[PDB]
Amino acid sequence: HDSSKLLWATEYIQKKGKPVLVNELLDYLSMKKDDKVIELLKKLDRIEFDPKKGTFKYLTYDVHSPSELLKLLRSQVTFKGISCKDLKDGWPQCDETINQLEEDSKILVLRTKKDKTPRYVWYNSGGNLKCIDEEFVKMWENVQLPQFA
Amino acid sequence: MPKKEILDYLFKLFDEYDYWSLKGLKERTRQPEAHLKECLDKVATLVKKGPYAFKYTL
Amino acid sequence: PIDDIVKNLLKFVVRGFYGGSFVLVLDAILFHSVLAEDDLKQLLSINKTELGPLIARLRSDRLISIHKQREYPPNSKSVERVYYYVKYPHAIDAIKWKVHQVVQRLKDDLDKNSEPNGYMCPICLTKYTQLEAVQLLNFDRTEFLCSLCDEPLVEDDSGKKNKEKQDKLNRLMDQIQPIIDSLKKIDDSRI
Amino acid sequence: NLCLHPEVSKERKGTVVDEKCRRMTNGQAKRKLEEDPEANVELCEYHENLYNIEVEDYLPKGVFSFEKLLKYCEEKTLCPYFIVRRMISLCNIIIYSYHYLLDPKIAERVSNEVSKDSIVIFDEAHNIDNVCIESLSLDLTTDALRRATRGANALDERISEVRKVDSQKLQDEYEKLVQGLHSADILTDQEEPFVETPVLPQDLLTEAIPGNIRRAEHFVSFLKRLIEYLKTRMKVLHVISETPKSFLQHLKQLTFIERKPLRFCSERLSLLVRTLEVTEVEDFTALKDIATFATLISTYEEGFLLIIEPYEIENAAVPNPIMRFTCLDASIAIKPVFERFSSVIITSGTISPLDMYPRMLNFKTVLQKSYAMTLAKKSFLPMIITKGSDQVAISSRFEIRNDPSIVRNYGSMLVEFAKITPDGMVVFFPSYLYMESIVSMWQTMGILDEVWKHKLILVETPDAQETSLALETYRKACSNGRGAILLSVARGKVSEGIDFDHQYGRTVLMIGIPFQYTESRILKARLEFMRENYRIRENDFLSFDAMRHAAQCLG
Amino acid sequence: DDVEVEKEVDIRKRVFNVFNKTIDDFNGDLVEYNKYLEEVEDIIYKLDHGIDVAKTEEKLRTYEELNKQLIM
Ligand code: SF4
């Protein structure tokens, strides 16, 4: 099949770590001899099989920045919010970006530790207010509030 | 299942059904799941959502 | 105007003393005035159990009110929504007095560490009152011996923890500093 | 605005471009290329040749405008900035804006040879006092303290890591502190200075020792105490008004730095940073702005006021507090301008009334003569549109939001003019926050629906390049056959310097009278000083500047 | 908050507490003050972190002597 051998050869371009020759790539697989693989490599954006000699070089929610993610939170004011999935699909390592855009700039929800921060898309203003001592957290909510009257 | 064999066989299976359920494809393979899953990792592009959820793609 | 400051007012309590997701429930109240619980469950993609108590923290602290949104859908089924209402003036009541008492509490540990009250025989494992003390001090003695150890005591509640509480007091004022006048900013209108 | 190197010209913000050229050729960085070859430090390639050929005479015979200077210097491998910055001592007439005669960080190159016996003209001098207010103003934010703590921590490593590199260079600058204010190599330089001085041009600064902070390690000692003290003074309960002298006293007890040593931070930072040959400056940008405040706090008092609001009132009750400091008396920078100058002229066609200017800035005029446009044709119709199609009083004083009783009248005004008026219509809203709700709610109804088809509408936007692209596509439309309408802000950038000829404007609309009370009590605190130091009340000051802003836009 | 620099105050305060007899401002001279400031920085900064605090304890020995100078 054309795709299977082409996939292995194109995957071999980045694995070798070298821009191996156009033909010498095929003999390394020893089975891929079609021109569609060469056509695909020539059609490959990641595999820079340019007009020159054989050169084997490696390469939804387009919000790849905290500036763009902040805009997403701005677009979802009084609106719904996706959790974390397409956010990291269009931008690898959102979680570090979440902490960098802290204090309601990447206002997420750390749903679980093993969930890779299954975030939430919400938009706050100051967000963090972490300076409150957890003792004052203890001291704030132990208060019996009078009812209607 | 060799990586080239997985690459050809999975593509042979993906040519039959690349847009197939991730559970259904494995039962169509029934081999040591590391080989079939690994071939899905480079010789396919995962679509977790949508109508073709968990369906191999390229 | 003022009610907008009330809208932002509860954010102070919610984003300081609670977690990150607690404003995510509160934000939805400001997001939709009649906030359906079934919708708010989807908005943050949190299940029924995870979203439940979050409203209660806003309900209990007089910040929110889950209004019983009973209505008749076309199917004639038992339709209920916990419409998290925003009771703005009553949430002011909760934040106002909660700031009031905590300042007293951190003061209390200061005075207690400045007035030794009891005693202790750490040898006989016995703590004593001063009245207990004045029973076993001998006229030939300067410190009240014991009755199981016949040994002197130690003063109780000395002043080595006194300095601990002032930082708690100072941290209380410096962290509640954004909150105190934010209530009084609203209390100018009393709405 | 005058850079020619493609590497430098890419960046948008002026300071980043200014930093890149300065780091390209700096008194301590450019030396590291000539004496030892390296790829870490490049060359401007235009200051390089200016350093060789340009500073020997004047430009041949051209009186170069901005358009003309750009074209000439491009072909002749010269950067026009370094020409005119040097041309101060050679230009029989010097062309620059108000800031470079008033702003203290940039007006250190002023030459008395061109200042003593010269004649000074202030163009559009109606907006003179407002600029001076910004000159002594600075805010802070809770995000910035995180950067400030970053700069405080990162410089602590920076000054210590270079100690093992060259410790004697560290101490060599210490003996430069006991001798004086580093005058030999802090002011007699071509490129060295990095930290700007917000104080008056070196006259309001003693030359004594900056306390016992000479040591690199001991410099960390008071830096970390003072940064902690300001943070609890950054999380203040609400806006509190204390005399800036008192801030030093409260600082004095919490962190014992005397007032005279604290005035010496600005010349200290350049004295210390230069020794470390620092290579990374991103987290150190907070250092120059905070230390700019440090020079201001120890020097200015009893004329200004310190305020710390725990949030912005439009987004109240949030951890976004400000170290608000704003100038109350603009004349402190104004008076030394008149102190040295002998020939001065102030002229503006929008100043009204013309009488509070001498009392506000404390300067001596002699000829107060007013001019009326004597023409055989009217050519202008100033209008007082109190009543609309509904014949209802229209304004923007009632609120800063939209309402069907009001918005339908203003939109009906815009469409009715769009049917009849010729090409060129410019409006100036009181504020940009006001307009965003105006246009979006206008889009909700079909009021703009007929306005859509009449003319070509381009909107004022926060990004200057887009608005300039919007405005450059406004003038061409106006000159072209199709009609065009521009919408802008009375407090926006358009009212500053933009001109509108016949085509570019025929009928201008003014939605209300612009009152700047929308912001927090910062201006209310500012307005109080005007009320007691001067006999100009809130009512007299508010309407007269608002119409001055109104008359600024109309002409 | 760089707890190493937290001890800088205590070293500095101990000079403000015990070693206050040092002639920095009472002497009047700027040259004497400037040398005193450099000497103050020599004692406090080394006593602040302590990377070379072997004469800093001796500076404490002199500081205690300065306290006796205040005392006597
Ligand atoms: S050398 Fe001149 S033109 Fe080049 S970056 Fe520097 S200032 Fe700009």
Ligand SMILES: [Zn+2]
């Ligand atoms: Zn006992």
